[PDB]
Amino acid sequence: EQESVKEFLAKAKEEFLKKWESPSQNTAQLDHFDRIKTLGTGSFGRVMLVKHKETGNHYAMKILDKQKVVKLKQIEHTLNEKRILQAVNFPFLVKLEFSFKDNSNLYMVMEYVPGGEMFSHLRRIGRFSEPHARFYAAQIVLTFEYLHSLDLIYRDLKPENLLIDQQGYIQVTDFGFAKRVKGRTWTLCGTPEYLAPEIILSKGYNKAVDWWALGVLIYEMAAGYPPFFADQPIQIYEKIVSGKVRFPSHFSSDLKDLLRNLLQVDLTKRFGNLKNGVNDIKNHKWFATTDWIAIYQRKVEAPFIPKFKGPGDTSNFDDYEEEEIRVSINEKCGKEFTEF
Ligand SMILES: COC(=O)c1ccc(C[NH3+])cc1
């Protein structure tokens, strides 16, 4: 309710809407870049480290195969991802620098963050101390305050999507499930361990699912494993809907209290979804040592700085089979992707 935050968010929304209404398109092409390395791969796309041939800058180029996007029912999702990313601007979101398409693929050319995914660092270290988890959590809280004020739901919070930058701060990547939603939406998406009960139960759900996922993330960062862990998805889902969570004895009382309010099965009682909105989270005791403005301004010294040798270093990412980027001589799926 600080007039300061109100005016910040009002300007943020004005700027977002202008870009949302008139999206950029076709701002580079493939032969402006050299291919370096595959950084990730999935059922309909890949992320490739590339270097711009004129500037020498490195980028993470997400390449989506239009035919596979169609087959796996991701058309609208890919259009969401690009339209949202070209319109947002926040310190903890990876920046989309260029986008374009060709006969075969869609391309989103993002700033490359060489420090790696939080997932790798968390697994390597085991767990994060509460201060370390809190530093990251505060960045997600502010990011969700920003996104939700724009009527955006993120829907893919998990450690793999949180890159650690050169200053040790988070950059959220992968807007593949992000959507502009006034009210409710219905698509089943997200990784099993992070799904809110109302997603599992096929309800019309809202931004409260992001706050649930933050609870899962904070738990996993501080414990080293997620709260509803089980060997198969159906067993995970039974635990999620049950309303039962066990906390390690090393968790502080303040942490347990915050988590009970984020991991609240009843979405109408969940922190982030009450009348006081995000302030129930920002004002919670677990965040008492957090200077929200200093986090936003990146003035807090980070818990650690990833080790890397320079902007082209791939040592914090892992190795994948290197496959061709073939571009068909014939246009595929042109109609479906006209707006991209
Ligand atoms: C800005 O995006 C990146 O730097 C990046 C994204 C995804 C991966 C692999 N999951 C690696 C790097």
> Which atom of ligand 1 is least distant from the CA of 40?
9
Return the CATH architecture of domain 1-22+117-307.
Orthogonal Bundle (1.10)
What DSSP designation does 298 have?
T
Neighbours of 244 (CB within 10 A): 11
Closest among 300, 296, 298 to 9, alpha carbons compared:
296
- Asked whether the beta carbons of 86 and 78 are under 8 A apart, the reply is no
- Asked whether the beta carbons of 76 and 64 are under 8 A apart, the reply is no
For the chain, domain boundaries: 1-22+117-307, 23-116+308-340
**What are the helix (H) ranges across the chain?**
3-21, 66-71, 75-85, 118-125, 130-149, 197-200, 208-223, 233-242, 253-262, 279-282, 292-296
Q: Which residues contact 122 (CB under 8 A, 6 or more apart)?
A: 128, 159, 220, 221, 224
103 annotated as ligand-binding: no
Return the CATH architecture of domain 23-116+308-340.
2-Layer Sandwich (3.30)
- Asked whether the beta carbons of 111 and 95 are under 8 A apart, the reply is yes
Dist CA 91 CA 335 (whole Å): 35
Q: Which residues contact 31 (CB under 8 A, 6 or more apart)?
A: none
Question: What is the whole-number distance in angstroms between the Cα of residue 112 and the centre of ligand 1?
Answer: 7
Q: Is the CB of 40 under 6 A from ligand 1?
A: yes
**What are the helix (H) ranges across 87-162?**
118-125, 130-149
Dist CA 173 CA 176 (whole Å): 9
Question: What is the whole-number distance in angstroms between the Cα of residue 17 and the centre of ligand 1?
Answer: 26
Q: Is the CB of 39 under 6 A from ligand 1?
A: yes
Closest among 330, 323, 324 to 67, alpha carbons compared:
330
Question: What is the whole-number distance in angstroms between the Cα of residue 215 and the centre of ligand 1?
Answer: 23
What DSSP designation does 34 have?
E
> Which atom of ligand 1 is least distant from the CA of 317?
11
Resolution, in Å, please? 1.2
- Asked whether the beta carbons of 157 and 214 are under 8 A apart, the reply is yes
Catalytic member of 65, 156, 210, 280: 156
Q: Is the CB of 61 under 6 A from ligand 1?
A: no
Token pair 């006034």 is at which residue?
182
Residue 156 bears catalytic tag: yes
3-state helix vs strand vs coil in the chain, percent to 5? 40, 15, 45
Query: One fold for both 1-22+117-307 and 23-116+308-340?
Result: no
143 annotated as ligand-binding: no
Chain breaks in the chain (C to N over 2.5 A) after: none
Burial of 80 (0-12, 13-18, 19+ CB in 10 A): buried
Residue nearest to atom 1 of ligand 1 (CA): 112
Residue 270 in tokens: 């969940």
Dist CA 340 CA 25 (whole Å): 7
Burial of 205 (0-12, 13-18, 19+ CB in 10 A): buried
Q: Is the CB of 145 under 6 A from ligand 1?
A: no
62 annotated as ligand-binding: yes
Question: What is the whole-number distance in angstroms between the Cα of residue 27 and the centre of ligand 1?
Answer: 20
DSSP bridge pairs for 107 = 63, 100
Q: Which residues contact 33 (CB under 8 A, 6 or more apart)?
A: 50, 51, 52, 53, 59, 61, 109
C-alpha angle 181/185/187, rounded to 5°? 125
Q: How many residues make up the chain in this entry?
A: 340
Neighbours of 319 (CB within 10 A): 9
- Asked whether the beta carbons of 258 and 290 are under 8 A apart, the reply is no
Question: What are the C-alpha distances in Å from 199 to residues 4, 204, 290, 308, 337?
Answer: 34, 8, 31, 38, 28
Helix (H, G, I), strand (E, B) or coil at 62: strand
Neighbours of 173 (CB within 10 A): 22
Amino acid letter, residue 12: A
42 annotated as ligand-binding: yes
CB half-sphere exposure, 173, CA atoms < 13 A: 29
Q: Which residues contact 41 (CB under 8 A, 6 or more apart)?
A: 47, 320, 321, 323
The CA-based diameter of the chain, rounded to the nearest angstrom, is 62
Question: What are the C-alpha distances in Å from 269 to residues 146, 208, 280?
Answer: 21, 10, 11
- Asked whether the beta carbons of 159 and 220 are under 8 A apart, the reply is yes
